[PDB]
């Protein structure tokens, strides 16, 4: 199926407490493979996946270099953004950036992106055509104009349609055992006793990859979306994910309820019943 390579950058200013915090993580699909933490000992881009580990010195020196560059721009940006908004020196503010590339089942470029936020909110973004921008507000306009004048979008398009997708492909091979795998959910049902006339019926999805999943509870074949407790997809910490959905059943009515699991690691959708 389709695949992605995404880099996530978080810049946090620390008025008084040294330089700003800079974090950079990289993902291929739902699997992180590298990290940089302005606080960490190394000051290098580091591995976080077993496959990227034997990449080479040239690769690690190059990536270390660029993430240190990304870092600088972001320290600078922090100052520039305080000015655009006439914000005070003592304020602690956030900047986030995400960029990456997708390829289809054919491994050919599909789409690219570059998202930038200030204070957990849209600041400026590359449009889907990779030539123009969408500046959220009046302050972001100045950046829009700046990058437009500097053909920033062309060299960005160059990377996302070339180096990005061609490297995603490289990684998909370097860790084809990790990245070309799907762990189908390990499912089951539990049944507790809330009171004497009610009971909790919980459907479980465990140890699955990738993250995308659908759990739905049904009464008499009729979806209970409005009466289901659905928790967000969390990480098992071992590279797989978990999830669960619960309904409250008027005792005896257990027969009427079924959990439905959809995951790409399944041949058929699963229909679970308490029986």
């Amino acid at each position: 199926g389709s695949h992605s390579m995404r880099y996530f950058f978080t810049s946090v200013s620390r008025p008084g407490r040294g330089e700003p915090r800079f974090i950079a993580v990289g993902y291929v699909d739902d699997t992180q493979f590298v990290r940089f933490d302005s606080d960490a000992a190394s000051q290098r881009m580091e591995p976080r996946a077993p496959w990227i580990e034997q990449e080479g010195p040239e690769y690690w020196d190059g990536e270390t270099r660029k993430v240190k560059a990304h870092s600088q721009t972001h320290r600078v940006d922090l100052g520039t953004l305080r000015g655009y908004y006439n914000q005070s020196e003592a304020g602690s503010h956030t900047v986030q950036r995400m960029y990456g590339c997708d390829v289809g089942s054919d491994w050919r470029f599909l789409r690219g992106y570059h998202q930038y936020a200030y204070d957990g909110k849209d600041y400026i973004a590359l449009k889907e055509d990779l030539r123009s921008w969408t500046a959220a507000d009046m302050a972001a306009q100045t950046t829009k104009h700046k990058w437009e004048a500097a053909h920033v979008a062309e060299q960005l398009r160059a990377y996302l349609e070339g180096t990005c997708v061609e490297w995603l492909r490289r990684y998909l091979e370097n860790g084809k055992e990790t990245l070309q795998r799907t762990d189908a959910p390990k499912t089951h049902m539990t049944h507790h006793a809330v009171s004497d006339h009610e009971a909790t019926l919980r459907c479980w999805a465990l140890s699955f990859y990738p993250a995308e999943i659908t759990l739905t509870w049904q009464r008499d074949g009729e979806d209970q979306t409005q009466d289901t407790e659905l928790v967000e997809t969390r990480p098992a910490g071992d590279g797989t994910f978990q999830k669960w959905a619960a309904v409250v059943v008027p005792s005896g009515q257990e027969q009427r309820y079924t959990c439905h699991v959809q995951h790409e690691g399944l041949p058929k959708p699963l229909t679970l019943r308490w029986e």
Binding site: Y7, G26, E63, K66, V67, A69, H70, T73, V76, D77, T80, L81, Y99, Y116, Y123, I124, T143, K146, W147, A150, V152, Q155, L156, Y159, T163, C164, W167
Partner: peptide, 9 residues
């Protein structure tokens, strides 16, 4: 593989 150049806002 990161983007080689990162322009300022």
């Amino acid at each position: 593989n990161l983007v080689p150049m990162v322009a300022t806002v």
